[PDB]
Design a protein around this nucleic acid. Structure first.
Ligand SMILES: [Ca+2]
Ligand SMILES: [Ca+2]
Lengths: 236, 239
DNA sequence: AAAGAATTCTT
DNA sequence: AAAGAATTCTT
C-alpha cells in the first residue's frame, strides 16, 4: 500500500543517506547545527521528494500549504477520492542518548473547527499520519571534494510512520501554544502503536474537550482515567 | 571595527553565494522549501562561519547556546573582558514583493530577569545586534539532484537582503506576537532598518517600555499601548 | 491591531 | 507536570 511503500521508502532513504550540510549553486557548503530547529527543517526537506515519489506511484496528488501556519505538511489524494484525503505531518524530537515525546499539533484549531488553519476542511481527511524523526544530539565552510569531512550533528536518526490518534497521549505537548502531546515512550512503542486511546473517536473527543490549564482540568479531567470516569458519569 | 567588518563580511557573502539545497555525504542534494521556517534555518547556518571568521580576526570567542530555547544565537567576548559581551541574533522575514517587520524576541524573559533563557546573564552583554535577512518569496521541487546539477536546482527566494543593526534601534512599540510575547520591530522599509530610523529616544527607553508592557489589551488599557502612552505613563509617575 | 495559529523545548 | 520559554506568521 501507499502507506507500506511510504514507510519503506523513508526507512530506506534514512539508511542510505546522511545529510551533512547546506550547499550553494557555486558549490560552497556550510555545515549544519545540532538543534531541532535545524534538524527538523532538514528532515522535512529530506522527506519531501520521497513522499512525492511514492504518492505519484500510487496516483495521489501531493499538496503542501500555500499559507504558512497551516496543517498539514502534505495532503495526498487521488482525484477520485476527494473526501478521502490523507494528511501527513513531519514531527521531530531528539534524544541525548531513552524515552521520547512529540508535540502533535494544536488541540484548538482544525480539530475543534473544520476549516480552522487547515488546507482542506477537516472532514475531507480520512487519515492523519505522523512521520516522526528522532535523533541523538551530537564553523568552517567546505567544498564538494570534502563531503565526508564534514562533521555530521546527530548520532543516529530513526523514522516511523504512524497514525496520530494512535501515538497521541493524554497530556498537552505545550502550554501557551496549546499542543497535543504524544505518548512518552521508547521508539518501539511508536512503531508498534502502543498508545493510550482505544479509538480515533476517543482521541478526538478527549482533545476536543481538554481544558487549557491545570486549574480547569482539575475540575473536568486531566488524564485518560479521569476522562473515562468523566464519560462514565455523563460528561459530569 | 568588529561591527563594520562583520557587516562588510555578511554583505559580500550574501552577494557571492546562493544557497540552493541540503547535501548528503553521498552527494545527493535535496531542494529547499521557500517558507521562513526553512529559510530562517538556512540563513543562520549561512552566517555562522562568517560571524566566526570575523570574530576570530578581532580576538573574540564565539559561543552558541547549549540549550535550545536560549538567547542569543551568538555570544562574542574577549577572554580578558568577559563582562563586555556582544549578543548577535539572526532574524528573518520576507517580502511578498516594501515595508517589512521582524519579531525581536521575548519581552518577558532575560529583559525582565537577568538570567531567564539567556546563555550569560543579561548584564554581561554590552550590545545586542540583530542580523536581519529579508527575502522576497518566490511565487515559484520534489525531486533530488546530484553534484553536477547545482545550476538546475530551483532557489526558494527571488532576492535576499541582509543588515546588521542594534536591537533597540529597530524596536517598535507594538508586540511582534500575542501568546508568545515577542517584541515587534518598526514596520518600515529595509532602508530604515539599515539606517536605524527607529522610534525610541534611547536604549534605556526601549528596555523600560518592553519591561513594563502588559501582555494583553485589557491590561495595557490602564497603562500604555504605544510610545505616546508610555511617555504619558512616565509623566503620571509610572502611575 | 490584537490575539492566537504554526513547531518543540525546558525549568 | 505545568507553565512558559525559543521563532514567525496570519488574521
Ligand atoms: Ca505541519
Ligand atoms: Ca511543511
Amino acid at each position: 500500500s501507499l502507506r507500506s511503500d511510504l514507510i519503506n521508502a523513508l526507512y530506506d532513504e534514512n539508511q542510505k543517506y546522511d545529510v551533512c550540510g547546506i550547499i550553494s549553486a557555486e558549490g560552497k557548503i556550510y555545515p549544519l547545527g545540532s538543534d531541532t530547529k535545524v534538524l527538523s527543517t532538514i528532515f522535512e526537506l529530506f522527506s519531501r521528494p520521497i513522499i512525492n515519489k511514492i504518492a505519484e506511484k500510487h496516483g495521489y496528488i501531493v499538496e503542501e500549504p500555500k499559507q504558512q501556519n497551516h496543517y498539514p505538511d502534505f495532503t495526498l489524494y487521488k482525484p477520485s477520492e476527494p473526501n478521502k484525503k490523507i494528511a501527513i505531518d513531519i514531527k521531530t524530537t531528539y534524544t541525548n542518548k531513552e524515552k521520547i515525546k512529540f508535540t502533535l499539533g494544536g488541540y484548538t484549531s482544525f480539530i475543534r473547527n473544520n476549516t480552522k488553519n487547515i488546507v482542506y476542511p477537516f472532514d475531507q481527511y480520512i487519515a492523519h499520519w505522523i512521520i516522526g524523526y528522532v535523533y541523538t544530539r551530537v564553523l568552517k565552510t567546505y567544498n564538494i571534494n570534502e563531503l565526508n569531512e564534514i562533521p555530521k550533528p546527530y548520532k543516529g536518526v530513526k523514522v516511523f510512520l504512524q497514525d496520530k490518534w494512535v501515538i497521541a497521549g493524554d497530556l498537552a505537548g505545550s502550554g501557551n501554544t496549546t499542543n497535543i502531546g504524544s505518548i512518552h515512550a521508547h521508539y518501539k512503542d511508536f512503531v508498534e502503536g502502543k498508545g493510550i486511546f482505544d479509538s480515533e473517536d476517543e482521541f478526538l473527543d478527549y482533545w476536543r474537550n481538554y481544558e487549557r490549564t491545570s486549574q480547569l482540568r482539575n475540575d473536568k479531567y486531566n488524564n485518560i482515567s479521569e476522562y473515562r470516569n468523566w464519560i462514565y458519569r455523563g460528561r459530569k
